Amino acid sequence: FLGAAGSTMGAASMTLTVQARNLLQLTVWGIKQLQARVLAVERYLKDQQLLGIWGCSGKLICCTNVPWNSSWSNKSQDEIWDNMTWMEWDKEINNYTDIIYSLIEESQNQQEKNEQEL
Amino acid sequence: FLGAAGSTMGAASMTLTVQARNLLQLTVWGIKQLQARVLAVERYLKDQQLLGIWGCSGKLICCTNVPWNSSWSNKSQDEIWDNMTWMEWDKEINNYTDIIYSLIEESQNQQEKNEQEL
Amino acid sequence: FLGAAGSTMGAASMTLTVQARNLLQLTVWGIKQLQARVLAVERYLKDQQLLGIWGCSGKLICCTNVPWNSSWSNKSQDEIWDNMTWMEWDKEINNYTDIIYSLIEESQNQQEKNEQEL
Amino acid sequence: ENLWVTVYYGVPVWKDAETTLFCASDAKAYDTEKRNVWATHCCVPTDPNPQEIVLENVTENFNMWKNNMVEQMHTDIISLWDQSLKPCVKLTPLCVTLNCTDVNATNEEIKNCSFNITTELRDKKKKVYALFYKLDVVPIDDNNSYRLINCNTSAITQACPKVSFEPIPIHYCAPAGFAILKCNDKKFNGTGPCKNVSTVQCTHGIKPVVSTQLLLNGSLAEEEIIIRSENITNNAKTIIVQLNESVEINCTRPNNNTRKSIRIGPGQWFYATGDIIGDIRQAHCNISRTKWNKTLQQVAKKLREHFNKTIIFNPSSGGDLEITTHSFNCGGEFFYCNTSELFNTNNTITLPCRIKQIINMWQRVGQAMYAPPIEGKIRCTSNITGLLLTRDNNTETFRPGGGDMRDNWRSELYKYKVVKIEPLGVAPTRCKRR
Numbered sequence: 001f002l003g004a005a006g007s008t009m010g011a012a013s014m015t016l017t018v019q020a021r022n023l024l025q026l027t028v029w030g031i032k033q034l035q036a037r038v039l040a041v042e043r044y045l046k047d048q049q050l051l052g053i054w055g056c057s058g059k060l061i062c063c064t065n066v067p068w069n070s071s072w073s074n075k076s077q078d079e080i081w082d083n084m085t086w087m088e089w090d091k092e093i094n095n096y097t098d099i100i101y102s103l104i105e106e107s108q109n110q111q112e113k114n115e116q117e118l
Numbered sequence: 119f120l121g122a123a124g125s126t127m128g129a130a131s132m133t134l135t136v137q138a139r140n141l142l143q144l145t146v147w148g149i150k151q152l153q154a155r156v157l158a159v160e161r162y163l164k165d166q167q168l169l170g171i172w173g174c175s176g177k178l179i180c181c182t183n184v185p186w187n188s189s190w191s192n193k194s195q196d197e198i199w200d201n202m203t204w205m206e207w208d209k210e211i212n213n214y215t216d217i218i219y220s221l222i223e224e225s226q227n228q229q230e231k232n233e234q235e236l
Numbered sequence: 237f238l239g240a241a242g243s244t245m246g247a248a249s250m251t252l253t254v255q256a257r258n259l260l261q262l263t264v265w266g267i268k269q270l271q272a273r274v275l276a277v278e279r280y281l282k283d284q285q286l287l288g289i290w291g292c293s294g295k296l297i298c299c300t301n302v303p304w305n306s307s308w309s310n311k312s313q314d315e316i317w318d319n320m321t322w323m324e325w326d327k328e329i330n331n332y333t334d335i336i337y338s339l340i341e342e343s344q345n346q347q348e349k350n351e352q353e354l
Numbered sequence: 355e356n357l358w359v360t361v362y363y364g365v366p367v368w369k370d371a372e373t374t375l376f377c378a379s380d381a382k383a384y385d386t387e388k389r390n391v392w393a394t395h396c397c398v399p400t401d402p403n404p405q406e407i408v409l410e411n412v413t414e415n416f417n418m419w420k421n422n423m424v425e426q427m428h429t430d431i432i433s434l435w436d437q438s439l440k441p442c443v444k445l446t447p448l449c450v451t452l453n454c455t456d457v458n459a460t461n462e463e464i465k466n467c468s469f470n471i472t473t474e475l476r477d478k479k480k481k482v483y484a485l486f487y488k489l490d491v492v493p494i495d496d497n498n499s500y501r502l503i504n505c506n507t508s509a510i511t512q513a514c515p516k517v518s519f520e521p522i523p524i525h526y527c528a529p530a531g532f533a534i535l536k537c538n539d540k541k542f543n544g545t546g547p548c549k550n551v552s553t554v555q556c557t558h559g560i561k562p563v564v565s566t567q568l569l570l571n572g573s574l575a576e577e578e579i580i581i582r583s584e585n586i587t588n589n590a591k592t593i594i595v596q597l598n599e600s601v602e603i604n605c606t607r608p609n610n611n612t613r614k615s616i617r618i619g620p621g622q623w624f625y626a627t628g629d630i631i632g633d634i635r636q637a638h639c640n641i642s643r644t645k646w647n648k649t650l651q652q653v654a655k656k657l658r659e660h661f662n663k664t665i666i667f668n669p670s671s672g673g674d675l676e677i678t679t680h681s682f683n684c685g686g687e688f689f690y691c692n693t694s695e696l697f698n699t700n701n702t703i704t705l706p707c708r709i710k711q712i713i714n715m716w717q718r719v720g721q722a723m724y725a726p727p728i729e730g731k732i733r734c735t736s737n738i739t740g741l742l743l744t745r746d747n748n749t750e751t752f753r754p755g756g757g758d759m760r761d762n763w764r765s766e767l768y769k770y771k772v773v774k775i776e777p778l779g780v781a782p783t784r785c786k787r788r
């Protein structure tokens with residue numbers, strides 16, 4: 001768990017099942033823990049719902065449509081997958097998180113579901 | 119959200135990703151809300167479980183086996199998808215909701231899973 | 237529900253959709269039931285998460301990699317699927333439950349996700 | 355022969371488990387005036403057309419003595435009573451010197467007592483009277499000066515005058531993911547395998563009847579008297595005897611009581627026994643002599659099969675009234691009947707009974723309740739469906755047991771077990787992923 005945090009992005013792909021696995025009286029002492037349990041479930045479901053929307057429900061590694069912007073990253077893979085860690089990467093992309101997600105939901109889903117019926 | 123409620127059934131198919139997206143102290147003031155959160159999760163999971171049974175877990179549009187009965191609907195698609203709205207449609211099918219669902223669970227699941235192992 | 241408990245393992249495969257379907261004021265009287273509801277959800281999600289990891293999320297019958305050990309069972313199918321019930325079977329495998337699950341998880345995911353991107 | 359691992363989900367198997375069960379009832383025929391504690395309006399209706407599935411070719415080990423359904427039922431009942439009494443009037447203002455004389459039942463057990471009670475206006479007290487049963491009042495002096503028995507230990511909560519405590523059959527039902535197994539072997543006794551096993555959503559309705567020597571209104575054995583014990587050779591254990599035939603008991607409270615409402619504060623009312631109208635007579639219970647005689651002899655005969663000694667019965671050895679007498683509730687009144695005439699022609703056995711209002715239920719000394727009087731007369735009809743017996747030679751002696759209420763529930767829940775479903779499992783096939 002987070003053993004790969006200092007590893008490069010490529011190497012860290014072998015721990016995706018580790019990081020993704022530990023996500024699951026009338027007194028305040030107890031009610032606050034019940035609330036925590038409900039929240040853990042809600043956070044879990046929100047990530048699963050989002051992956052479902054993107055067509056990534058069965059995948060830890062999920063290729064989608066939407067090419068990369070030079071405004072998001074101008075690095076070669078020689079640096080991104082081999083030298084950088086995921087923390088370092090998140091620190092550079094961060095500002096574009098919402099942008100990228102909208103571009104998948106509004107594309108990958110609509111342009112596959114209508115086409116599949118047709 | 120429900121912007122498509124007045125739209126025809128076909129047009130409304132573009133908003134399936136919208137309608138499906140907003141589904142997620144020791145005082146009564148707060149306990150009733152904790153209970154509401156638990157219920158929202160339970161309703162969400164029941165719909166997801168049912169889609170899984172029908173083989174529709176990854177789809178917003180899911181074709182299944184089971185042909186239509188003239189007792190369910192005798193309209194052409196010229197009216198159903200192009201003039202009628204989903205509210206109007208639900209008002210005509212309603213009585214057959216349980217019938218159609220049973221016919222998918224008892225067919226689409228059993229006749230695909232045994233065959234896939236074989 | 238458990239009607240197939242006395243049936244053989246093969247016959248019982250027709251009820252997988254049955255067994256898998258029924259899984260979903262301030263006072264102790266009420267708080268204990270709220271806690272029970274939260275637990276039912278947590279148990280449900282843990283089984284679904286595990287099936288997802290194994291690549292079995294959409295299936296009631298899921299073939300995986302990992303061959304059988306004679307140390308687990310040296311019984312022929314002539315008895316396993318045609319004469320034995322699932323309770324009887326669980327009583328013979330039990331000790332290897334964690335072993336098999338570990339082998340599926342650590343093989344089936346890593347050997348598919350990378351191969352699919354590549 | 356190259357078999358591969360295949361995962362199956364929805365496998366019909368189970369493991370023993372302990373979980374939270376819920377209250378369910380058959381009828382919603384109960385109104386909101388009665389407020390029966392077992393019609394809480396927080397208890398759900400059960401299935402009017404319940405299913406039961408017979409499991410063929412299965413064996414299941416049942417154990418009534420280690421059964422956790424019993425502990426849960428016990429806990430729910432204690433909790434229910436404490437909650438029901440929570441908002442009602444406290445009688446701590448009555449712990450005052452009582453000036454008591456005998457009632458005019460003259461030429462026994464009822465005392466006419468005077469109190470000094472603070473009225474709604476704190477500057478004034480009023481002198482008032484109430485009648486009390488002797489069992490509720492302890493002398494302070496050798497003079498006519500008395501105290502209520504609880505002031506020495508605990509505060510009293512007055513039972514809510516509008517709340518019924520009449521038993522209503524309750525079904526204990528499993529939560530999602532769980533199931534209840536039922537043993538259908540007619541002769542199933544204590545612990546061991548049951549061959550005829552079935553699955554239900556829930557238990558039959560069980561009436562939460564409280565009694566200490568004779569079990570009342572339960573379910574009868576199908577063919578013969580069944581004797582159940584954890585360890586039949588351990589004299590410290592209760593032996594639960596289930597009868598295959600009921601014996602009726604007719605109980606009454608023959609004097610006509612009246613109720614006197616005494617204000618003890620700003621909306622705080624105390625209900626006192628007022629004057630007795632008509633004759634003053636003793637409470638009692640009626641058991642047919644012939645039915646009792648054959649029943650007790652059959653119990654001795656069946657007990658003999660486990661001891662091979664001549665079996666006799668004796669009256670209880672001593673303790674407080676809850677253990678020495680047949681304690682039971684009827685009509686909301688609390689009776690303590692003397693059973694020395696049972697554990698010993700064509701007449702009726704009439705057992706004298708005493709009645710008391712200050713109660714410490716389930717041995718919870720420190721939490722007293724006051725049972726307000728009921729106007730008019732009381733008539734009860736009940737069935738003896740079993741006995742709670744203990745043991746001390748070429749003979750053996752049995753005596754009434756009881757006191758600990760869990761023994762009265764083991765007698766109904768002995769047939770049930772809670773298991774959880776574990777639907778995920780593995781079996782061999784030549785089918786492989788690719």
Ligand SMILES: *[C@@H]1O[C@H](CO)[C@@H](O[C@@H]2O[C@H](CO)[C@@H](O[C@@H]3O[C@H](CO[C@H]4O[C@H](CO[C@H]5O[C@H](CO)[C@@H](O)[C@H](O)[C@@H]5O)[C@@H](O)[C@H](O)[C@@H]4O)[C@@H](O)[C@H](O[C@H]4O[C@H](CO)[C@@H](O)[C@H](O)[C@@H]4O[C@H]4O[C@H](CO)[C@@H](O)[C@H](O)[C@@H]4O)[C@@H]3O)[C@H](O)[C@H]2NC(C)=O)[C@H](O)[C@H]1NC(C)=O
Nearest residue numbers: 388518563570571682683684685729730733734735736737
């Ligand atoms: C083992 O099982 C047995 C069998 O169930 C248990 O024995 C039962 O115990 C019950 C509770 O003690 C007892 O019920 C009381 O019976 C009294 C006598 O009733 C006679 O008249 C009725 C007439 O019936 C018709 O009217 C009623 C009115 O509701 C309808 O409901 C019926 O459907 C009929 O339409 C006969 O049916 C009986 O057979 C008798 O002849 C009743 O008076 C008493 O009711 C009063 O007390 C109630 C307390 O909860 C209260 O809710 C109700 O409203 C009444 O109270 C009014 O009157 C009093 C008078 O002082 C007043 O103070 C109140 O303010 C209010 O105005 C109950 O109905 C069962 O009859 C009895 N069964 C038998 C066969 O004896 C046994 O207890 C159990 N064992 C143990 C250990 O628990």
Ligand SMILES: *[C@@H]1O[C@H](CO)[C@@H](O[C@@H]2O[C@H](CO)[C@@H](O[C@@H]3O[C@H](CO[C@H]4O[C@H](CO)[C@@H](O)[C@H](O)[C@@H]4O)[C@@H](O)[C@H](O)[C@@H]3O)[C@H](O)[C@H]2NC(C)=O)[C@H](O)[C@H]1NC(C)=O
Nearest residue numbers: 607608609610611612613629630631632633729730731732
């Ligand atoms: C226990 O003692 C109680 C008190 O004495 C008994 O109550 C009494 O019972 C008798 C017999 O039924 C009643 O007599 C009848 O009364 C009605 C009229 O009643 C109405 O008018 C009176 C006037 O005082 C009023 O008090 C009542 O509340 C009514 O408004 C007549 O029409 C009949 O013919 C007959 O006379 C008494 O009235 C009644 N008293 C009270 C105060 O209710 C009770 O029955 C005894 N219980 C037992 C089991 O013996």
Ligand SMILES: *[C@@H]1O[C@H](CO)[C@@H](O[C@@H]2O[C@H](CO)[C@@H](O[C@@H]3O[C@H](CO)[C@@H](O)[C@H](O)[C@@H]3O)[C@H](O)[C@H]2NC(C)=O)[C@H](O)[C@H]1NC(C)=O
Nearest residue numbers: 669670672673674675677678679690691692693694695708
């Ligand atoms: C239940 O009822 C029985 C009677 O059926 C009660 O037993 C009787 O209790 C009285 C108590 O005063 C005994 O009287 C005393 O007996 C001793 C004997 O040595 C004597 O020395 C005393 O002077 C006095 O007479 C009476 O004998 C006894 N009856 C029998 C047959 O033993 C019993 O106490 C009642 N129990 C309850 C819990 O109410």
Ligand SMILES: *[C@@H]1O[C@H](CO)[C@@H](O[C@@H]2O[C@H](CO)[C@@H](O[C@@H]3O[C@H](CO)[C@@H](O)[C@H](O)[C@@H]3O)[C@H](O)[C@H]2NC(C)=O)[C@H](O)[C@H]1NC(C)=O
Nearest residue numbers: 570571572574598599600601602603734735736737738739
């Ligand atoms: C105490 O035990 C006796 C039996 O020893 C119980 O008496 C039995 O009660 C049942 C009701 O649960 C009666 O069954 C039904 O009675 C109705 C009456 O109209 C009838 O129409 C139905 O066809 C059916 O027979 C049963 O006959 C009756 N047995 C006798 C011999 O009367 C009694 O209810 C138990 N409880 C109490 C408090 O007495």
Ligand SMILES: *[C@@H]1O[C@H](CO)[C@@H](O[C@@H]2O[C@H](CO)[C@@H](O)[C@H](O)[C@H]2NC(C)=O)[C@H](O)[C@H]1NC(C)=O
Nearest residue numbers: 002003004005006007008009011082083084085
């Ligand atoms: C922390 O950084 C150091 C320095 O880069 C990593 O150690 C070497 O990294 C280079 C990168 O190409 C490898 O070629 C070397 O083989 C690594 N050294 C060794 C001894 O293997 C170090 O591994 C980084 N930390 C983590 C967790 O990877």
Ligand SMILES: *[C@@H]1O[C@H](CO)[C@@H](O[C@@H]2O[C@H](CO)[C@@H](O)[C@H](O)[C@H]2NC(C)=O)[C@H](O)[C@H]1NC(C)=O
Nearest residue numbers: 120121122123124125126127129200201202203
């Ligand atoms: C409400 O009904 C009106 C009337 O049908 C819809 O307006 C027209 O619908 C016809 C149907 O074939 C179209 O061909 C026209 O082009 C629509 N009018 C316009 C100006 O586009 C109206 O759109 C319906 N409401 C909604 C939300 O669709």
Ligand SMILES: *[C@@H]1O[C@H](CO)[C@@H](O[C@@H]2O[C@H](CO)[C@@H](O)[C@H](O)[C@H]2NC(C)=O)[C@H](O)[C@H]1NC(C)=O
Nearest residue numbers: 239240241242243244247318319409410411412
């Ligand atoms: C319980 O075991 C019995 C005995 O095997 C089962 O009954 C027979 O099982 C054989 C097994 O090959 C079948 O060929 C027979 O046809 C079965 N008998 C009948 C009348 O069909 C019985 O079915 C088992 N219980 C369950 C629930 O299957």
Ligand SMILES: *[C@@H]1O[C@H](CO)[C@@H](O[C@@H]2O[C@H](CO)[C@@H](O)[C@H](O)[C@H]2NC(C)=O)[C@H](O)[C@H]1NC(C)=O
Nearest residue numbers: 405406407408409536538539540550551552553
């Ligand atoms: C085994 O137990 C089952 C109940 O689980 C018994 O089946 C009941 O038999 C009676 C007989 O008249 C029927 O009225 C019930 O409707 C049956 N119940 C169910 C659920 O089928 C069965 O008879 C018992 N067998 C033995 C040998 O005791």
Ligand SMILES: *[C@@H]1O[C@H](CO)[C@@H](O[C@@H]2O[C@H](CO)[C@@H](O)[C@H](O)[C@H]2NC(C)=O)[C@H](O)[C@H]1NC(C)=O
Nearest residue numbers: 452453454455456466467468469483497498499
């Ligand atoms: C209440 O207490 C008093 C004395 O403690 C009891 O005795 C009465 O005392 C008064 C004092 O003046 C006398 O006038 C009365 O005549 C006494 N009564 C009798 C019968 O002699 C009184 O009896 C007690 N009351 C109760 C209900 O116990």
Ligand SMILES: *[C@@H]1O[C@H](CO)[C@@H](O[C@@H]2O[C@H](CO)[C@@H](O)[C@H](O)[C@H]2NC(C)=O)[C@H](O)[C@H]1NC(C)=O
Nearest residue numbers: 451452453468469470471472478479480481482
């Ligand atoms: C409280 O109780 C006491 C006695 O227990 C009452 O005192 C008696 O009051 C009467 C009134 O005439 C006197 O005649 C007695 O002599 C008093 N007894 C004693 C021992 O002095 C007292 O009055 C009661 N308080 C109230 C408010 O009634």
Ligand SMILES: *[C@@H]1O[C@H](CO)[C@@H](O[C@@H]2O[C@H](CO)[C@@H](O)[C@H](O)[C@H]2NC(C)=O)[C@H](O)[C@H]1NC(C)=O
Nearest residue numbers: 491492493494495500501503504505506507674
């Ligand atoms: C106050 O409570 C104590 C116990 O908490 C009582 O002591 C015993 O009470 C029982 C009850 O019948 C008697 O049989 C014992 O003989 C009592 N002990 C002694 C040493 O006598 C005490 O008696 C209670 N107060 C009063 C006034 O009785």
Ligand SMILES: *[C@@H]1O[C@H](CO)[C@@H](O[C@@H]2O[C@H](CO)[C@@H](O)[C@H](O)[C@H]2NC(C)=O)[C@H](O)[C@H]1NC(C)=O
Nearest residue numbers: 416541542543544545546547548583584585586
């Ligand atoms: C019902 O009673 C029988 C005895 O008639 C119990 O038999 C068991 O026998 C073995 C033999 O060594 C003893 O070790 C056990 O202790 C006995 N069990 C008990 C509970 O004493 C049988 O187990 C009893 N219960 C059931 C459900 O069959």
Ligand SMILES: *[C@@H]1O[C@H](CO)[C@@H](O[C@@H]2O[C@H](CO)[C@@H](O)[C@H](O)[C@H]2NC(C)=O)[C@H](O)[C@H]1NC(C)=O
Nearest residue numbers: 544545583584585586587588589590591592660
């Ligand atoms: C019932 O419990 C009693 C408890 O003592 C067991 O009997 C005795 O157990 C002690 C344990 O040290 C032995 O030393 C004694 O020799 C035992 N007594 C006899 C007569 O053997 C008793 O065995 C238990 N019975 C069952 C059926 O479990």
Ligand SMILES: *[C@@H]1O[C@H](CO)[C@@H](O[C@@H]2O[C@H](CO)[C@@H](O)[C@H](O)[C@H]2NC(C)=O)[C@H](O)[C@H]1NC(C)=O
Nearest residue numbers: 602603604605640641642643701702703734735
């Ligand atoms: C208990 O009370 C019941 C009635 O409440 C008695 O049953 C009556 O018995 C007589 C005997 O001849 C019959 O004639 C009546 O018809 C019965 N009544 C009913 C309603 O059936 C019963 O006998 C009493 N038991 C005792 C021990 O006295």
Ligand SMILES: *[C@@H]1O[C@H](CO)[C@@H](O)[C@H](O)[C@H]1NC(C)=O
Nearest residue numbers: 066067068069070071072103
């Ligand atoms: C990059 O950002 C610009 C901003 O206008 C946008 O027009 C272009 O389409 C984006 N490229 C990608 C790959 O989304």
Ligand SMILES: *[C@@H]1O[C@H](CO)[C@@H](O)[C@H](O)[C@H]1NC(C)=O
Nearest residue numbers: 184185186187188189190221
């Ligand atoms: C239509 O309903 C009838 C009712 O008997 C049924 O027999 C027929 O198979 C149904 N058709 C479809 C498409 O289910």
